[PDB]
């Protein structure tokens, strides 16, 4: 039986991070977590490209630009969505997730989904550094592992 | 009338399995079930490729890499999703299923959906070895049958 | 004004039927209804290709194989989905319907949706031969009418 | 500032109408409304192509055939969906709308959505000639306006 | 074992339709459905005799006149009865059905019962073109099938 | 398509009216309505035969005597039944209606059912000249139309 | 049978619009809708006369002045009435409607009633551009159609 799996060492890997600006206070914590993960797993900060976009709606189109660069091994998508009074939340989150997934399949490159979709502000605060750990860190781990995996798998 | 149907014999077939690492305790049981099915239906374990991915979100992109290998007859996707407090579960499960289906149609190769989507942990425990039988076994049977079917159908 | 419409005569038409094996007791009734419709509207049973697939998840990929055969005029998709305890039903039904629709648009060939999506077993029993008439018969009628329509429309 | 907008004059425009046969009593009223709109806005009835399809499921595939004809300026899709006891309504309406939208984007031609999606029969009766005006008329107006718009825009 | 059954082809068959005038709005839809069925199953409209009667009470006596013509193969009875405030509905529906059945047995000719007996107007609207399909179409199918059956059976 | 229908002109037609004597106050209004209809649609009063019978039970046997006269074109049956305390109402109304229908089928002559079957006196008052129009007038119209119809149909 | 009906083309027609000033915010939207309708149906804006009046009470007397001009084909009356605390609303709306109708009959010229009579402000907002479409547009369509109709009818 052949086993393919990725180590959690980030030596030599190049990363791209797309972070929305809306929900500024929490997206900053998520980005801090992602950079901390990449650096403390052996990666250099000089090998990280950070792209700032106004809202979550533009994360897919910015990730399309980063992910087609040859010198990028994986892309981390970071954003915070909190449900409001209107159904706007549903139609934004669905399109963001769908675009990211379609892009990842199209470009044959791991694009990791580190976007928080919370019903309440309190949940988003939990998932961005407090009791539940930040999805920035979780997404960075996923991206590192897939970047290592695809080196063997390709 | 022409009838096309697949036998349940796994002699000579090559399989690929993509298993997420999240929900480690149950995904291991699902993978055990899938391998047991393939082996006990006549297949060899040396003809199975196992790919481990961090979460369910990356199953489609890893299955895209396995399914384009010529020496793979079918791909079994294995993962466990349990609904949490946030609507994150919906946007993950929808994208995983949609990506797998689109990939299967695109590559003209059977990609079987052995992912558990449970509201509660108790349901997931039921569907992964206990009272309801493991979807790893069910997915392996589906993959074997489609692999045999496409030999006749093509 | 130009009117394009299809007659309900099945002389000379070739059909493909994809039927899942899950919910064996009801899918058999649906297939019986479809074949009865095709035969009693003038079609021959020697001009029908039947493909059996394990579950509803594989209906799109099998229909992709039948529908690209030149000697097939329309494809009838037959399956039964009954909602269970998990949200698995939603993610299966959505992908089956989406795959069938995308395939039909891509191949410019009518693929008729004769899949039962029931909340309860009692509804599925109603819609498969009992009080509400079988969707196998309804789907066969739709396929016959579109097959006749596209002869004029093309 | 450049303003692009379409007049509501139908002189010289060619139209295609796809109408399902299910819910016969109301689809006939919708088609009457659409033809009345086209004729009373200056269009000729000899410049209208009407295609009849069995159910709403086949509207996208028939619209694909009409919309690729060069001598068709816009396509009007007409159908009536009333929610039943099963979730079948959701999976039919979603696929019809998605197919129509994808087709319109693909063919760069306006395909107007004049399909009634009603929870109850009483609502469908309202929206097909009675208190709320028929979506056949509304869809015909939309198609006329886009047909005029694309002449300037292209 | 000898099997006698009728095909659903209407080539060469002659039909008679008796339609009441009461409930004008729905009987017209039922008659449209019946004629559409006969025409789209291969029959000609020149081979259909339509008899209009004031109320449902006179359908049996008019069907007695049509059914004794030699050049009529089957008779379709079309009418709409909606229960009112008085028990008049019972004594009308019972006599209509009894007369039609006795006439059919006496003349050894299929007389198909396409009369709607509804408790409420909403049910009658359902059964005459809307959600439940029109009994005009159902009765026309029954008449076609029996007309084909009696050719073999006699 | 051959259309048979009767005009509403009563020139030259001969009518027979059987009216019960029970419920004298309302049967008189019904008879007035019937005669008014026949006269104002062009018929002469000298061409009307009126037969008075004690109760509704004897209407069928008197109509048997009128309807076998050659110089009678149609027979109008007029009576009023109001439900009492005993089930007598059911067994009278059923037999009256059944006898009239059987007689009409036997003699191949239109016998129109203008009998009021009311649960309460207030309903019978409504249906005999007041808010709901008298069944004498309605029955006379039905008889005129069938008399004209059978001239063409025979 | 002679059919008289008006097309929806506004070429060459001259219009007069009387708009009250009370409920300034909504009357402006209604006037915008009316002018947009006239322009986009082929009419010129140079052929429109706009008269502003203080309240709805003066719309009839101003419409009397416009409608007697020879070079005016139809008059559109635009105003918004919202019920207050006093019965003043009833006595204003009744007189406005009565005056407009009497004027239209007297001058043999179409005067279209595009006045909103709302119980609540929320309804008036609905009917002036939002969910229910603006009565300015509806009234302009009515005026165009009657202006075309009277050309044939006179």
Numbering used by the authors:
A (entry chain 4), B (entry chain I), C (entry chain F), D (entry chain Q), E (entry chain h), F (entry chain M), ...: 1 to 154
Recite the paper's sentences.
The second mRNA vaccine candidate (LS-P2-VP8*) encodes a multimerization domain derived from Aquifex aeolicus lumazine synthase (LS)35 fused to P2-VP8*. LS from this hyperthermophilic bacterium naturally self-assembles into 60-mer icosahedral nanoparticles. LS-based approaches have successfully been employed in other vaccine studies to display antigens on the nanoparticle surface, thereby significantly improving the immunogenicity of the presented antigens. The success of these studies is likely due to the fact that multimerization of antigens on a nanoparticle surface favors the generation of potent, long-lived immunoprotection in germinal centers through clustering of B cell receptors for multiple and simultaneous binding to the antigen epitopes.
In order to characterize LS-P2-VP8* P nanoparticles translated from mRNA in cell culture, supernatants of cells transfected with LS-P2-VP8* P were purified by density gradient ultracentrifugation and analyzed by transmission electron microscopy (TEM). mRNA encoding lumazine synthase alone (LS only) was employed as control. The pooled gradient fractions were analyzed using negative stain EM, which showed a uniform distribution of spherical particles with hollow interiors. A cryo-EM structure of LS-P2-VP8* P nanoparticles was determined at 2.6 Å resolution (at 0.143 F.S.C cutoff). In the 2D class averages generated from the LS-P2-VP8* P nanoparticle dataset, image classes were observed that show diffuse, nonuniform density protruding from nanoparticle surface, which may correspond to the P2-VP8* portion. However, ordered density corresponding to P2-VP8* was not visible in the cryo-EM map. Only a short segment of unoccupied density in the cryo-EM map at the end of the C-terminus of LS was observed where the P2-VP8* moiety is expected to be present. Since LS and P2-VP8* are fused via a flexible protein linker, it seems likely that the P2-VP8* protein portion cannot be clearly visualized on the surface of the LS nanoparticle structure due to this flexibility. The 60-mer LS-P2-VP8* nanoparticle core is ~15 nm in diameter with ~2 nm distance between adjacent VP8* protein as measured between the positions of C-terminal LS residue from the cryo-EM structure. Our data indicate that the protein translated from an mRNA encoding an LS nanoparticle domain fused to P2-VP8* P is secreted in vitro and self-assembles into 60-mer nanoparticles.
